[PDB]
């Protein structure tokens, strides 16, 4: 029985015998659906994950230069020229610098100067496109009340896993003796990934806006090619210093890693699992089809033996109460007697159960079960079992305006 | 007018709503023989024996198939009964019954074809319920799912009343008054 620990929990209510209920699944959040005359089920989005994305553009945030060369020329001796001037791997700069007798020239004035450097790219970051063919949401479904915090569901009938894509938003999940649930999840309202790039920088991953990505002041290449690619705007990491008569020192700026890290302070963070990316930003409007769902023991007899406590009843973050009971009887499967009475003489049911129609499934003695109850405000009594050996436990619920 | 059948001998009764109890599960590891439960050979119990994958990851020394078996005590909650009508205890009145049975289900009655009745997929017995009857073919309502190390989740089908009813659509509607039955 999940969600009880979860802070951002919802309680979607049913109808009389309806067919559809709308929910919104947020990452880390959880939705407890309680339809009338249906088992209570827990729906939660557990993994948004992207893969096989097409690279769009890579920026360089750490470059190096080697084997630079300059060429000088006196006034009236034409423009300066190197052969490495046309090479794309080489970044260059033209400038005019004062010349005279004091440095080889026949007359005082301006001489031509050119300087080139070989552009290497030590490290780069890559932005990838997020097509619908890359998304794959995974939703977990768990009927309230089973045998016993983690995931080991493949065997459990109360628990089922489903996967959803933008090009396959529909899925069905069988829940054993509880029937089956339906899911039609709109991926458009999921998140506007048509305005987002997936940024990868040295094992660190983010989701960035496309326009912010396009406005990054770094050298860059498009898509990608083996060996050595052609870098545009190399001048973002390579500056020229103060020009002399026959030379001009060229220097590469330091690493721009921390700069970008800071530029990404509020950006969405992505986890990395090999060639797969794993988001934690979740939003999914889903339509739950419920008519194929069913209660297990509508016609069970009640549990006549004694229930006992195993944990002392605790209050959740939402005011509800979780209890864990041990049933010694062997007349299982049977129906669990569980209500809340404000008056022990009449046993008139007040409040409501969250775990709708609790049922012991095993006929072996000393079984365990977790019940969740939604008590009234103030004092009341949690009542479990029947007759003499019934558990009556005083409870109190606090107030409003959080 | 008063077309009336007299006392009838019950042919065969089909259960359409069923329940389980005393459900138990035994599982042995590899090189340690097949699994055994007490009520495995019991006739009131529906059972399932299969082989599940065992290893270190689920509490066993050596890798390989281990023998699992699960047994649940089958019991009937709602059944329909069939009756044979011979042109012997029948009585015409005014102011082919070798092909028909008198089907009765939850206070509603029909006259149905022999073959159709004899070939419906539900648990059944023959004779009459003096209590403790043997239910044949209980697997029609109780199935075993998810072969697993320590257990095997059983599932009981819900009432097949609606399906049986919708099957009897183009069927001869009848009626009864006490220990007899009014025809038409």
């Amino acid at each position, epitope marked *: 029985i999940r969600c009880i620990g979860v802070s951002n929990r919802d309680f979607v209510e049913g109808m009389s015998g309806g067919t559809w209920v709308d929910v919104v699944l947020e990452h880390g959040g959880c939705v407890t659906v309680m339809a009338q005359d249906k088992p209570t089920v827990d729906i939660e989005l557990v*993994t948004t*994950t992207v893969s096989n994305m097409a690279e769009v553009r890579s920026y360089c945030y750490e470059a190096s230069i080697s084997d630079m060369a300059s060429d000088s020329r006196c006034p009236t001796q034409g423009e300066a020229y190197l052969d490495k001037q046309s090479d794309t791997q080489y970044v260059c700069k033209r400038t005019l610098v004062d010349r005279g007798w004091g440095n080889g020239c026949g007359l005082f004035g301006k001489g031509s100067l050119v300087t080139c450097a070989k552009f290497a790219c030590s490290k780069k970051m890559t932005g990838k496109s997020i097509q619908p063919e890359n998304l794959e949401y995974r939703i977990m479904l768990s009927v309230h009340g089973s045998q016993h915090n983690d995931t080991g569901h*493949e065997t459990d009938e109360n628990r089922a896993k489903v996967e959803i894509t933008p090009n396959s938003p529909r899925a069905e999940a069988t829940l054993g003796g509880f029937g089956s649930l339906g899911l039609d999840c709109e991926p458009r309202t999921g998140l506007d990934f048509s305005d987002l790039y997936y940024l990868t920088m040295n094992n660190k991953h983010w989701l960035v806006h496309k326009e912010w990505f396009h406005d990054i002041p770094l050298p860059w290449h498009a898509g990608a090619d083996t060996g050595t690619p052609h870098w545009n705007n190399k001048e973002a990491l390579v500056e020229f210093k103060d020009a002399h008569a026959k030379r001009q020192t060229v220097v590469v700026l330091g690493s721009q890693e921390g700069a970008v890290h800071t530029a990404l302070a509020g950006a969405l963070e992505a*986890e990395m*699992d090999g060639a*797969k990316g*794993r988001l934690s930003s979740g939003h999914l409007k889903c339509r739950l089809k419920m008519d194929k769902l069913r209660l297990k023991g509508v016609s069970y007899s009640l549990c006549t033996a004694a229930f006992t406590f195993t944990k002392i009843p605790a209050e959740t973050l939402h005011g509800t109460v979780t209890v864990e009971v041990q049933y010694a009887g062997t007349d299982g499967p049977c129906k669990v007697p569980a209500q809340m009475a404000v008056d022990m003489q009449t046993l008139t049911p007040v409040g409501r159960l969250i775990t709708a129609n609790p049922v012991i499934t095993e006929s072996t003695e000393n079984s365990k079960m977790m019940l969740e109850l939604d008590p009234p405000f103030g004092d009341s009594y949690i009542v479990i079992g029947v007759g003499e050996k019934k558990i009556t436990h005083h409870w109190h619920r606090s107030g409003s305006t959080i | 007018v008063t077309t009336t059948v007299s006392n009838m001998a019950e042919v065969r009764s089909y259960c359409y709503e069923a329940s389980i109890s005393d459900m138990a599960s035994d599982s042995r590891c590899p090189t340690q023989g097949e699994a055994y439960l007490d009520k495995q050979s019991d006739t009131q119990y529906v059972c399932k024996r299969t082989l599940v994958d065992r290893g270190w990851g689920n509490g066993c020394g050596l890798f390989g198939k281990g023998s699992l078996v699960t047994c649940a005590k089958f019991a009937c909650s709602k059944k329909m009964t069939g009756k044979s009508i011979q042109p012997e205890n029948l009585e015409y009145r005014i102011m082919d019954f070798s092909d028909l049975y008198y089907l009765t289900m939850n206070n509603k009655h029909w006259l149905v074809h022999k073959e159709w009745f004899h070939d419906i997929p539900l648990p059944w017995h023959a004779g009459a319920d003096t209590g403790t009857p043997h239910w044949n073919n209980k697997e029609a309502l109780v199935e075993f799912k998810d072969a697993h190390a320590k257990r095997q989740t059983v599932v009981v089908l819900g009432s097949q009343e609606g399906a049986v009813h919708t099957a009897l659509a183009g069927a001869l509607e009848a009626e009864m008054d006490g220990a007899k039955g009014r025809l038409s």
Partner: antibody
Framework: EVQLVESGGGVVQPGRSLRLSCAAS????????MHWVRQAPGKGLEWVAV????????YYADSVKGRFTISRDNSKSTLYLQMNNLRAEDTAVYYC????????????????????WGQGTLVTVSS | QSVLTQPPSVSAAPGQKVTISCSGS????????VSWYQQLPGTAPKLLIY???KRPSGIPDRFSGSKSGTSATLGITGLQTGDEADYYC???????????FGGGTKLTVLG
């Protein structure tokens, strides 16, 4: 340009030990999980072991438990398998293999598949 | 006799169509992702299918993958003699906490 190269296998004797190595070149080796998968002569593939992206998670076949020890050096992009107390039925061509995931999650294992494969190394336990 | 069971062998004429199955449990094939691996004679295994029905680049559209219940199928159509090989299904097993391969299936293209 992904490539994996196994090495360190030969004609070893039983009871003793051996240490296989795999050289990776074409990826961020310290970002993907790594597999050891062996194949007896003219037999089927038998998955031996797996280690995660950082080396905090290791899984072994029930046949090679308490005898084999998988490890890795991210610093030089190498995969090590440490087999001690060998047997006859450990005789096989040993392949190392790139996963697709690094196994950085709970959901990693159920999605895992062996992406790129090496070329193998014959390990004979002759006695 | 195997955790994932696939038939020992299968055969078909050139130009025909053949499918290879492997069956498991809810703890492996049922919930996890099935992948297929082709092993040509005297050659390292090669990834054929991933995520139960996806093809790596370079793998022709003749190859297809499907998954239903606790069994998965690989489909090879427009069969060629070059397809003659040993085919393996594989997936992670959650109960045994162990990655598992199928027994293998020798595909022969009758000549």
């Amino acid at each position: 340009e992904v490539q994996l190269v196994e090495s360190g296998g030969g004609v070893v004797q039983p009871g003793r030990s051996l240490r296989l190595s795999c050289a990776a070149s074409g990826f961020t080796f310290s970002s993907y999980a790594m597999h050891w998968v062996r194949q007896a002569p003219g037999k089927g593939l038998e998955w031996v072991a797996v280690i995660s992206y950082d080396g905090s998670n290791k899984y072994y076949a029930d046949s090679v438990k308490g005898r084999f020890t998988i490890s890795r050096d991210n610093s030089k992009s190498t995969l090590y398998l440490q087999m001690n107390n060998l047997r006859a039925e450990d005789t096989a061509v040993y392949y190392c293999a790139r996963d697709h995931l690094g196994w950085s999650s709970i959901w990693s294992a159920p999605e895992s598949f062996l992406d790129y494969w090496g070329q193998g190394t014959l390990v004979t336990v002759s006695s | 006799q195997s955790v994932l069971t696939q038939p020992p062998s299968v055969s078909a004429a050139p130009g025909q169509k053949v499918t290879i199955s492997c069956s498991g449990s809810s703890s492996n094939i049922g919930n996890n992702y099935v992948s297929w691996y082709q092993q040509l004679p005297g050659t390292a295994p090669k990834l054929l299918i991933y995520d139960s029905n996806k093809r790596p680049s370079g793998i022709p559209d003749r190859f297809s993958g499907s998954k239903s219940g606790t069994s998965a199928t690989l489909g090879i159509t427009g069969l060629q003699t070059g397809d003659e090989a040993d085919y393996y299904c594989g997936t992670w097993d959650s109960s045994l906490s162990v990655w598992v391969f199928g027994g293998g299936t020798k595909l022969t293209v009758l000549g």
